[PDB]
Amino acid sequence: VRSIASLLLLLFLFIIIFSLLGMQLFGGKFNFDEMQTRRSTFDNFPQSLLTVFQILTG
Amino acid sequence: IQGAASPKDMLILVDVSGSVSGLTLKLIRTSVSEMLETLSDDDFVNVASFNSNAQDVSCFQHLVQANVRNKKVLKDAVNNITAKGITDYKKGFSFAF
Amino acid sequence: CLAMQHYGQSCLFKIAMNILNMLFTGLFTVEMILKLIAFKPKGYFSDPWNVFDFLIVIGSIIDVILSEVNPAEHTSITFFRLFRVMRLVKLLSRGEGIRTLLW
Amino acid sequence: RRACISIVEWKPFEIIILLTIFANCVALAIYIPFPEDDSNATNSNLERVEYLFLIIFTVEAFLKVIAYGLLFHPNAYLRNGWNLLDFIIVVVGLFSAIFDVKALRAFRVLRPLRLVSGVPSLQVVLNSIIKAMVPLLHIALLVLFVIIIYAIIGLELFMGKMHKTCYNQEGIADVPAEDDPSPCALETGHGRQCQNGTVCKPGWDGPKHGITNFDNFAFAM
Ligand SMILES: CCCCCCCCCCCCCCCC
Ligand SMILES: CCCCCCCCCCCCCCCC
Ligand SMILES: CCCCCCCCCCCCCCCC
Ligand SMILES: CCCCCCCCCCCCCCCC
Ligand SMILES: *[C@@H]1O[C@H](CO)[C@@H](O)[C@H](O)[C@H]1NC(C)=O
């Protein structure tokens, strides 16, 4: 466990970084005239995490 | 409408701020149009908009009787609008009142 | 040169690419002829890689010869064109770690 | 005099510095990126909090450069810290002065990467992870070459053949007839054909937004 928590903490930190970067890049720029089916968006941090997680699993 | 309500003096404070850019702006414009569709000829209207400054989308600057014609100007102005700036309810409402 | 071409290409650009195509197939034919003079066909076919080179160059020249006619105008079979790119695989052989891993 | 600053590092303020890094990491999830220049109240106080973080980080950089010297400090994992301070200074100055000035705000998302460095208990696991990366480089080059070969082959074969889609034959309005534009090819070219009441003619109906076709070489890759 004490060794497991390190790896998972590192991965959690990486996801936070690549979500906080997406916020500053695509933050609220997913507003298109088309119907807003863009559920997997970068708007707010709690959902940037879900989008980054979705990308990771691909 | 002539029966369900007395005349009105509307003042639509369309919120053209950055937070509405996209689909929501289209909904706002369509809704404003479908609302001006519900004004008779004996009840006035105007369309302000606030983005830290309460401009007027039209050339009127006061209430304009919502004829069949002034409605056209207001609808065209609404259609030709774009989001920007920072939302500021206090200024917009002060201008409206 | 292969990767350069793109949609909406200019006729002059197409001509230049055809020129470079002929030039490169000529250089590789020089490769082949120099190798043959270096040692005879029996030794030339010793390793498949040179045998692999055999079909590419002939196919490329077949492509160029086929290009002499003009089915299209700068105003059909399209199989032998891929040998030029497939010749890139030779570059993968230079690396030894990758060679051993794949083998 | 330099010793007085240096002996401060003996006093464990690195704990408060890492708590400050964590505070800044928190102070970035709350920052909502409104679409077009909009900003609620919180976004208007996070600039002040960012100024505070700037000051504390630059004070720490000054202390750890004066106590450890100009030449030696870059020769360490601290390479990023000074880099972050430089870009954050430039960003704040340019933003106050006023263009790419705003977009440059993204360089602060590296500060969480300072957290892992601060806790050397994790640098070991980072080194473990990157250590296993080196063997893959052979697979990296193999996949790169496969990508290049197949992209070039795609350029040779599907050379922008996905730009013709089925259009309405009435002709009043010229919009992709099918709600899902599916590249069709007119007869004399093997492929599908329009339904009984539409015609497949050139244009750029193409694939989704014209982002996945084989036109260029970058598009192929
Ligand atoms: C109008 C003729 C266009 C040029 C075609 C000639 C073939 C050579 C390309 C031009 C020179 C650039 C350098 C070629 C590589 C040495
Ligand atoms: C339009 C003429 C008929 C089709 C011509 C292409 C046939 C071969 C396609 C596949 C070739 C690439 C093989 C994969 C790479 C080694
Ligand atoms: C005689 C020594 C052979 C050394 C290994 C060469 C491997 C070549 C094939 C690699 C797998 C296919 C990749 C490209 C497919 C289009
Ligand atoms: C490590 C514990 C503290 C983490 C939070 C520090 C920053 C909080 C200040 C900003 C909070 C919003 C206040 C804006 C005024 C309504
Ligand atoms: C829209 O309004 C703006 C106001 O700046 C004006 O410049 C422009 O000509 C108008 N365009 C249309 C489509 O009416």
Curated annotation (Swiss-Prot), chain B:
Glycan-carrying positions: N80
Subcellular location per the Swiss-Prot or TrEMBL entry: Membrane; Cell membrane
Coiled-coil features, chain-numbered ranges: none
Motif (MIDAS-like motif): 15-19
Tissue: Isoform 1 is expressed in skeletal muscle. Isoform 2 is expressed in the central nervous system. Isoform 2, isoform 4 and isoform 5 are expressed in neuroblastoma cells. Isoform 3, isoform 4 and isoform 5 are expressed in the aorta.
Residues the entry annotates as binding a divalent metal cation: D15, S17, S19
Domain of life from the UniProt record: Eukaryota
Post-translational modification: Proteolytically processed into subunits alpha-2-1 and delta-1 that are disulfide-linked.
Functional note: The alpha-2/delta subunit of voltage-dependent calcium channels regulates calcium current density and activation/inactivation kinetics of the calcium channel. Plays an important role in excitation-contraction coupling.
Family: Belongs to the calcium channel subunit alpha-2/delta family.
Domain note: The MIDAS-like motif in the VWFA domain binds divalent metal cations and is required to promote trafficking of the alpha-1 (CACNA1) subunit to the plasma membrane by an integrin-like switch.
Other facts noted in the record for this chain: Binds gabapentin, an antiepileptic drug.
Linked pathology: Developmental and epileptic encephalopathy 110: A form of epileptic encephalopathy, a heterogeneous group of early-onset epilepsies characterized by refractory seizures, neurodevelopmental impairment, and poor prognosis. Development is normal prior to seizure onset, after which cognitive and motor delays become apparent. DEE110 is an autosomal recessive form characterized by profound global developmental delay and hypotonia apparent in infancy followed by onset of seizures in the first months or years of life.
Protein name: Voltage-dependent calcium channel subunit alpha-2/delta-1
Annotated source species: Homo sapiens
Range within the parent protein: 245 to 341 of 1103
